[PDB]
Amino acid sequence: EEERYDLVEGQTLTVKCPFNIMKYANSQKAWQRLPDGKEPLTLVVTQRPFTRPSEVHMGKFTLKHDPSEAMLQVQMTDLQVTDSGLYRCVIYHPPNDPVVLFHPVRLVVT
Ligand SMILES: [Zn+2]
Ligand SMILES: [Zn+2]
């Protein structure tokens, strides 16, 4: 179910994650990394009010919340080989289990 994204170091990863607006208009969203045998790492989250279009920066991560297109877009800039790993976009609502959007992204940076 994971999709491979093969990129060269220095490139920017862009991932478009649709979300169901009827269900998740007023929910927080997040980008997570999934290290093997560890808890998900939440890398960047949207901010309140959760229904509003937004763009948040957190280090090399950018999350664009585009409800007009029922879309969350994630960008990671200046990729390094050590960014290689499994990631996902989610509906974020702890302590409830995240709802996975789209499909997991297997990022391979060389
Ligand atoms: Zn929720
Ligand atoms: Zn290289």
From Swiss-Prot:
Disulfide bridges in this chain: C17-C89
Keyword flag Transmembrane helix: yes
Compartments where found: Cell membrane
Keyword line: Adaptive immunity, Cell membrane, Disulfide bond, Glycoprotein, Immunity, Immunoglobulin domain, Innate immunity, Membrane, Receptor, Signal, Transmembrane, Transmembrane helix
Taxonomic superkingdom: Eukaryota
Swiss-Prot/TrEMBL GO biological process terms: adaptive immune response; innate immune response; neutrophil chemotaxis; neutrophil extravasation; neutrophil migration; neutrophil-mediated killing of gram-negative bacterium
Main location: membrane
Boundaries of every Ig-like V-type domain copy: 1-100
A single Gene Ontology CC term: plasma membrane
Regions of this protein lying in the Extracellular compartment: 1-110
Knockout consequences: Deletion mutants do not show any influence of the antiviral T-cell response. However, TREM1 deficiency impairs secretion of CCL2 and TNF-alpha by neutrophils in response to viruses. TREM-1/3-deficient animals have decreased neutrophils in the airway and these neutrophils have a defect in transepithelial migration.
Role this protein plays: Cell surface receptor that plays important roles in innate and adaptive immunity by amplifying inflammatory responses. Upon activation by various ligands such as PGLYRP1, HMGB1 or HSP70, multimerizes and forms a complex with transmembrane adapter TYROBP/DAP12. In turn, initiates a SYK-mediated cascade of tyrosine phosphorylation, activating multiple downstream mediators such as BTK, MAPK1, MAPK3 or phospholipase C-gamma.
Subunit and interaction comment: Monomer. Homomultimer; when activated. Interacts with TYROBP/DAP12. Interacts with TLR4.
Protein name: Triggering receptor expressed on myeloid cells 1
Native species: Mus musculus
